[PDB]
Design a protein around this ligand. Structure first.
Ligand code: TYD
Ligand code: TYD
Lengths: 375, 373
C-alpha cells in the first residue's frame, strides 16, 4: 500500500454510506483503509466490506458533556482513536463533516485531513459568516469560542488550533455544484455513487413493471424513532394510491388497511428499485435524494435544510414539494399526477443526471488525494 | 461511459473475495456492478458491500460437474433470464465457471475471465488446441467444444474458443509465476479482501516476540488430517507467538499458542514475521503483498504445489512435504525463515514488484475500453 487512510464517519448509516464508495475507490487503488467506529455500529462497517476499528464506549446516536459525544470529540472516545491512530499513523484522515474527532487526531498526528459533506455547507457557510464579522472587530475582541474550546482538546495532545480543524484541509462535496452554498473554501467535486445498505435483488425486481412504479421511502435514520404522529405517511400513501400505479412503500411494522395497488417492505435496496421507478416520494434527506437524482427519477419531497435542497431541486424542474403541515391527500395525488404527466420533470431530471455522471467519480478523486498527501 | 457489469463467481469464499476489489474498483468508477450467486450465499456478497443477485438453486461445494461449473439448467436458465433483462455490457467470470461466458456470448456482451489459481485450464486447453491442429480435419474432435456448443445452442448461440478463455484474462497471480500460454493477459495487483474484518484489542498491542500465523485454509475446513497438530506443536518449540485457526481439540496447546476463531487476515499479517499456510491463493497472496515470508505445506487439490514451489524458488518461502514432514522439520524450517534475513529481504523484493503492478483502480479504464471497442 502507498497510503494508510483513516475514516471517521458519524455513527449513523446515511452518514456512513456516503463514505463507502470513496472508501473503496481508495482501496481499489491499493491503499489501506480503516474505518473508526463506536463498537456497537461495527457490523454496519464490516457490512460495507470495510475494516472497522472499534473505538470508545457504545453510543446510540439516535436516542441522543452530552454535546461532545455527538461529534465524537468527547474524552473517552477521542483518546482511544488517538491511541490507535498514534500506533497506526495514517497519512490521511477523511472525516464526516459533523465529527471533530478526526481532525483533532489529524493535527495531533500531522496527517492530511479532508472533510466530506453529507449536506449543504452550513458549518462552513456559517463559520464563514463569523470569520468575516470577527474580522472587522477591535482585535482584542476577536473572540472565537469554537476555536479556543477546540485548542484546549487539541492542546491535550500537544497540538495548536488552526482554521483547518473546522473545515479540513479540503472539503469533498457530493451534492451537485450548483446547489452548493457560497463560501470561499477548497471544494472537491465528487459524483455521488449510491450505497444503500446490503442489497439483495429479489426476483420481482428483475422484470420491467407493468404500471408506472412509485417509490415511497424514508430512509432509516429518520422514521426509526419512532422506536421509543405518524399520520403524514398514511396520508401520502393514501393520496398516492388514488392514482393507477403500483406503490412500493418502504415501511416498518406500523400502520394502518391498505390500498390494493400498494406493497410494503421493511428494507428494499433503493438504488436498484429506483432503476424501475417512475416517481420517488421521499422525506428530503440526502442519500435517498441523490440515489433518486443520480437515477434520473423525478421527485416528490416532504422536508441539509431538507427544504432548501428540495427547493433547489424543485427550481431546476425535476421535482416538486408539499408542506408537511398543510398537505392533504389531494395535493399528494395532484402533485404526483404532474410529475408522472408533464414530461418536463422526466426531462429536467435527466439533464441533471447527465450533469452528475460527468463530475469526477470517487475513482477519479483518488489521485487528487494522493496528490494532496504528497505535498 | 457508464457500464452495466455482472460478476459470476464460483460460489466459494476464496474465489469470491478474489473478485471484490475489482468489483468495487468499478462501482467506485460509477459503474453498476452485480454479483450472480447461488441463494444460500448472498450474505457473503452483501457482506462485502456488493449487490447480490440470487441465481439458480442452493449449491454446496443437474448432474454435478454441470452444477459445480454453474452450467446446469437451474443456474444457467436463471442467469440468462436476469441477464436477458438487465442486459449487462460486461461479464467478468471466475475462471472455473462456464455460466458467465455462456450467458455473455448469448447476449453478445464483452466478457472477461478472471483467474484465481494459475492458468491450468488455458495451459491444458491450448496444449490440446495445439495437438488437435496436427490432426486431419475429420478427426479434430473438441469434446469440450461440443459440450459447450450445445448449451449455447439453446439460446441462438455458437461455440467460440473465447468461451473457454474469455476475450482477455485478468491475472492477479504475480506474473513471474505465470504458465506460458498465449493469451490476452491483463496483469492486476492483488488486493486482499479477507471477509469481515474488525480490530480485536490484542492486535492493538505491539508484538513482543515474532508473530507466526497458522491458517488451515481457510475456508475449508471440509470434512467436519491432524498434520495440523504436528504443525502447531513444532513452532511452539521456538520463542514466537502463534496466532492460529479453528475450534478443534487435540489436548493441551503450549503456552505461546494464542488461539482465536477468526482473525482478519490482512490486518493480522502486519505484525507477523512469518506465516504457515495450506498453499491456497488469497492466503498466499494476502501474505505475499504483506511481504511476509511463508512456510507452505501445500498439496493438494490444485496448483498449491507449483505456486508454493515457485515462491520457494525466489527464496521467499520454504515448503514442507505433507504426510512426510517431521515435527523437527516445522522448526528447522520455521527457524530458517526467522534466522535468515534473506527470506524477508526477498519477501520484500517480490512485494515491492507487485506494488508496481497496476491496481484494480488502474484496470478500470482498460475494461472500460474493452467494452467500448
Ligand atoms: C428504508 C430504506 C432505506 N434505504 C437506504 C437508502 C439510503 O442509502 C439510506 C437512507 O438515506 P437517507 O434518506 O439519507 O437517511 P436518513 O435521512 O434517515 O439518514 O437507507 C434503502 O436502500 N431502502 C429502504 O427501503
Ligand atoms: C481463517 C481465516 C480465513 N480468512 C480468509 C481470508 C482469505 O481470503 C480466505 C482464504 O481462502 P483461500 O486462501 O482462497 O483458501 P480456500 O480456497 O481454502 O478458501 O480466508 C481470514 O481472513 N481470516 C481468518 O482468520
Amino acid at each position: 500500500s502507498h497510503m494508510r487512510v483513516l475514516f471517521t464517519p458519524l455513527p449513523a448509516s446515511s452518514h456512513f454510506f456516503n463514505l463507502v464508495p470513496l472508501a473503496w475507490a481508495l482501496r481499489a487503488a491499493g491503499h489501506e483503509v480503516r474505518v473508526a467506529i463506536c463498537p456497537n455500529m461495527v457490523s454496519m462497517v464490516t457490512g460495507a466490506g470495510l475494516t472497522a476499528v472499534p473505538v470508545g464506549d457504545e453510543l446510540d446516536l439516535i436516542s441522543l458533556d452530552a454535546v461532545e459525544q455527538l461529534h465524537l470529540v468527547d474524552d473517552r472516545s477521542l483518546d482511544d482513536l488517538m491511541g490507535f491512530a498514534e500506533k497506526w499513523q495514517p497519512d490521511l484522515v477523511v472525516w464526516d463533516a459533523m465529527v471533530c474527532s478526526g481532525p483533532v487526531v489529524a493535527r495531533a498526528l500531522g496527517a492530511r485531513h479532508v472533510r466530506m459533506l453529507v449536506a449543504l455547507d452550513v458549518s462552513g457557510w456559517l463559520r464563514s459568516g463569523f470569520l468575516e464579522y470577527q474580522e472587522s472587530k477591535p482585535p482584542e475582541q476577536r473572540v472565537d469560542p469554537l476555536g479556543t474550546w477546540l485548542g484546549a482538546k487539541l492542546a491535550k495532545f500537544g497540538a495548536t488550533f488552526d482554521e483547518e480543524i473546522v473545515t479540513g484541509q479540503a472539503t469533498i462535496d457530493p451534492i451537485p455544484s450548483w446547489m452548493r452554498l457560497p463560501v470561499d473554501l477548497d471544494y472537491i467535486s465528487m459524483r455521488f455513487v449510491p450505497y444503500n445498505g446490503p442489497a439483495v435483488l429479489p426476483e420481482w425486481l428483475r422484470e420491467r413493471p407493468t404500471k408506472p412504479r412509485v417509490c415511497i421511502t424514508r430512509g432509516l435514520t429518520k422514521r426509526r424513532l419512532s422506536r421509543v404522529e405518524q399520520a403524514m405517511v398514511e396520508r401520502l400513501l393514501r393520496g398516492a394510491a388514488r392514482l393507477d400505479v403500483e406503490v412500493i412503500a418502504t415501511l416498518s411494522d406500523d400502520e394502518v388497511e391498505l390500498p390494493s395497488n400498494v406493497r410494503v417492505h421493511e428494507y428494499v435496496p433503493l438504488n436498484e428499485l429506483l432503476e424501475s421507478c417512475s416517481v420517488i416520494i421521499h422525506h428530503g434527506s440526502t442519500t435517498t435524494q441523490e440515489t433518486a437524482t443520480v437515477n434520473g427519477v423525478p421527485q416528490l419531497i416532504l422536508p441539509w435544510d431538507e427544504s432548501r435542497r428540495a427547493e433547489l431541486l424543485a427550481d431546476r424542474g425535476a421535482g416538486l414539494v408539499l408542506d408537511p403541515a398543510t398537505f392533504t391527500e389531494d395535493d399528494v395525488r395532484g402533485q404526483l399526477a404532474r410529475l408522472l404527466d408533464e414530461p418536463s420533470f422526466a426531462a429536467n431530471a435527466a439533464l441533471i443526471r447527465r450533469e452528475i455522471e460527468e463530475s469526477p467519480s470517487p475513482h477519479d478523486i483518488v489521485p487528487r488525494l494522493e496528490k494532496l498527501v504528497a505535498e
